[PDB]
Design a protein around this nucleic acid. Sequence first.
DNA 1: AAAAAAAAAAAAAAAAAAAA
DNA 2: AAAAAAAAAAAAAAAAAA
Lengths: 313, 311, 312, 316
Amino acid sequence: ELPRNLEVFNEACGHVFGSSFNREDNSVISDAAAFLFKMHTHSLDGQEAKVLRASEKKRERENAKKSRKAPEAGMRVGRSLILTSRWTEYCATCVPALGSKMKVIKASGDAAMIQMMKDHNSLLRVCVRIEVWKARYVSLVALDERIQTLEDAQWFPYLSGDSYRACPGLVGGYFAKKAAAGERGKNYKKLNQTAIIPPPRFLIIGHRLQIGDQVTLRELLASIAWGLCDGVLAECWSPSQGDGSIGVVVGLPLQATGSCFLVVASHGLSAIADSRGNTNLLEECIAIQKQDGVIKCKRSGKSLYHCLKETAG
Amino acid sequence: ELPRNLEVFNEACGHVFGSSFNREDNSVISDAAAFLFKMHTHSLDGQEAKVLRASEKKRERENAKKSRKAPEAGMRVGRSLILTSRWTEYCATCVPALGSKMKVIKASGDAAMIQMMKDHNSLLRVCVRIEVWKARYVSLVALDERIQTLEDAQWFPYLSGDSYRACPGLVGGYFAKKAAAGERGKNYKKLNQTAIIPPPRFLIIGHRLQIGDQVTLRELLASIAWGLCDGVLAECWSPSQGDGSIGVVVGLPLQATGSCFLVVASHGLSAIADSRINLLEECIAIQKQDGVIKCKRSGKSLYHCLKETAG
Amino acid sequence: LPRNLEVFNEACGHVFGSSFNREDNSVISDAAAFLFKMHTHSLDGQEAKVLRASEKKRERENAKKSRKAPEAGMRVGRSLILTSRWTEYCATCVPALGSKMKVIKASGDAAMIQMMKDHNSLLRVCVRIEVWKARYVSLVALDERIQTLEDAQWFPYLSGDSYRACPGLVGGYFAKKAAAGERGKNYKKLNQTAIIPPPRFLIIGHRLQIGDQVTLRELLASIAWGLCDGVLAECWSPSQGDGSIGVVVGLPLQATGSCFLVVASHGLSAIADSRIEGNLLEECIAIQKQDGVIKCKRSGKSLYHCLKETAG
Amino acid sequence: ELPRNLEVFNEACGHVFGSSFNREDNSVISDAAAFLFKMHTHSLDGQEAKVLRASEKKRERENAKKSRKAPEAGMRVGRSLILTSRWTEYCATCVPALGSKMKVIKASGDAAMIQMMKDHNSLLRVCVRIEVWKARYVSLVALDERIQTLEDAQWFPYLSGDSYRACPGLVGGYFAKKAAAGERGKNYKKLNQTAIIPPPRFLIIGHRLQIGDQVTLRELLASIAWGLCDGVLAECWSPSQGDGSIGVVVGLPLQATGSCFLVVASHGLSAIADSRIEGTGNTNLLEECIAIQKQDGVIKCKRSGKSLYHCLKETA
DNA sequence: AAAAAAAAAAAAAAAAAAAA
DNA sequence: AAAAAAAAAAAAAAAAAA
């Protein structure tokens, strides 16, 4: 009925949170996904330490983490999630042992082990996507102090190393900065900061975001952009005739590509980083694909977070 | 009627330095503050050894410090401070034992011990504020060699770990950099290199800095900024009749809003450094007796401005 | 004509019959590419590159070897048709896979040595033609590998054989590696903008010169590429009704270029350019004309964008 | 008679190059030092391969290196250096095995092994210094294409990873770039680009560069600066009364102390990486000074405003 | 505000520790 | 000048690699 990824995510969430997992709230799904991701990187207290090439301080931190008691059952997580007594069984069963690699499992040849590893990787990917989406949603109302210049804002979102490894094409941060600065291999992916990510309640059902869906302005905006993208993207929403909290998606932005403006030095010339302004820099236009067709909407010239705050005024 | 914070420091300084402690000389107050800070941090000779996890060299240094003869009455600390015979009693009775933690003091329930611990903590905060002000004052005429590039200049003042542990919001340095390069949370504080610190002679008596109070140019400049800040801040000081190295404050700069107005390039649009928006035309907001005014930046560091205007 | 061009002309004739037009850039480029593939044993039914090939590479080489070879009359490009003689040529002139000049020299066979030298010259000519075609293509559509000036510095990006044949002109990954290798007498500096006559001029030894009828795109490709400065367009003047034909009025200098930086040291201030001391869009290029060198102000836009705007 | 480092370098060069090692030429000493460095890093053909964490291409390259025959006795290196028949014995004896670490040897406790490891470390450092000096000397007459902007020139000289590991305080390149960009630990060292490196003929003798020494202009300049440094440094040379090709050193430049023209942002203002440049002035830039310590005393010499390489070319 | 908690008597170059 | 060597055929998601 559903692909492997969504099926495994639903199974894991149901097993670990029992009946307390709501399937129609973005925050609850996000909390469940974040908790599950924590459960799969060997980061929770009482899990195997990371000491392969750990510095003395890292050795101490990992030893302290290992010594500390693991989370107990019946524990409240997030706002409306309560662990079930059988979460330990799922953790012991479906969680690969620390250091597990696909090469070793394939050499062993165990079909069950291979399937469990595939499910683990798929759940990692789905939870990383949900966590990036929730990061976008948070940035729509609460600015991050770390981001202070376009040079820093270029690497948003800031996420842990395992998050970068799972989805290098979507997750930025320190690891993405190092990868971009270092040698670029065959597996290098450029940080597609504004990739489309369906909301949590759709990302676990497979219903791809599209026109006609009934969604809130904040959730749609965090899906298609983040806190510091231009406010013109707000045009992609239309309030409904009812309460107005949940509207309808009318159109989605289109990703422009190409058209480099560099001019390499030759015959005694000097390089030009950008050939280009004020009039076009301010107004500008963005291509929004609607049901009727593509429309060029002039950019509002302001941050999305500022636009949302002003509208809330 | 001074707050307990300043009362504790005044009493300690009196007990430790007799009449030699002048409450009107900034250098003397600073020397006494540093002395009290090193005493209450267990760094004076003959004090307990920091050998909880000391390395070989650090273990040897701590053992030598413990073995070394402790300071005696009549010792000269600075230029115009002399220890008294009561300093030994003050250290024995007021300084908490090495490694003492407020958890154990609260668990014991002794009200006197809790009061002593609170007094020690407040005294450390006061002495750290005074030390930060002294670092700002010194850097107005002689810059730290560790400051070579904007990255290094972003972390002034460079004070030891204990100082940062006392007032995280003011002291920069290696520990501030480490905290910056580590985890962040509610308990995390931001280094405010230009947070207003009243001068020592004004700090220990509770007098807040305000327009119209007699101060020196260096005093105000260190009390509102440091050596490498834009020279425009010098406008906050105006000499009196005949100057005489003493003037008056005419304003106090306002702080910058932390709101970020960036708009990152996306979907083909062009990135904007400031949605609201020349470099030498920027203005600072000064709160004067009348109201807020805008003063154009000078473009030169206070250190260089003082060097050039010295003669 | 020099043997370097004579070998290419003879091979092209023997392979393509009379269909090999010698006055069209596209036809010559297609023929050169086909000959380069033939002499690299990259065609169907040719040898297999299995010295150290990995499992998948080994399998693909085996499949290519087993795959049927091209037959006479095959249509290559748009206006080139193979001749039955080509096989014989491919049987004789093409060196066996893995043959090294050391073994040929040790053998002492004069015929084999001459064949190897002819093969090397043919490879050099084919690589030059491929570089010109790459510039021509880049003049309309840009490769995505070039996003920053650092990546643009190594254009064109060609295989290792291309760099080996003509290290002076070809760049790519192998040129990047050689830059980090070491410096010596054999070391040749990359010249991204060397004057290469169009294929219709190269195979006949028609060195580009002022007064030669050439298309604007032809001249731009032969003396520049897509991302160069648009001011180079000053070197071409149209004719009656243009009609994609004009004339060369001048050529840019060979563009040696020296670095005039002065890095800060011992407290002195860094200088980004020694000459400028005492404006970014005011820079000018030197063009040698029939009369003398002239300074032409830069346009500030890449040649690609200039051409795109001119088209529409 | 001489420190440990110079003694071990002389011993190694004498053992490896026999009597063909000319002790009074810069180029010959540089070639010998570079060859010793390559031998001691296990990069000569016929030495252990580096495969601990090697990528497939690196594995192939190292396997090819291992398979190839090692250099034979009498092979010509550089210009006037010929290997002796006993170089293989020295390479096998004095070169620590690939992956050798000082911790393992210290745990073993073998005095001979510890001494050999210390000698290898010292020779690595001396050869790195010689090769850095030679890179400078080459930059005085042959520009580098890699250096197109001040950002790139900030990392000169470029050298291999082991070269950076041996002498982080002088060697730049990719590895210094990575260290600076990444976390800065307790062992981090800034690139002292223009440190004073006595010529290789003195660097192997211990005669520190100082006033009164007879040296060429090119060698002295490469010792106290590199290709793109300011031209005023040429004032540190005084042509002799004879031919004038080879002169004497009068004074050495002093690493400036006091230039802190930064202006950090505060109260909404913006940082200034350098006051003079942002001042939009040229008068100061043409009237700078450099503090040359001479025999009589310190002197302030006005900067010539042109690259050292260009000044050398124009003089010739 | 309450809580929690490394050659300018004392800040470059070379050495022993650590390790394109 | 020589030697040494979703615009029949260019993003998103999956199985390979990590």
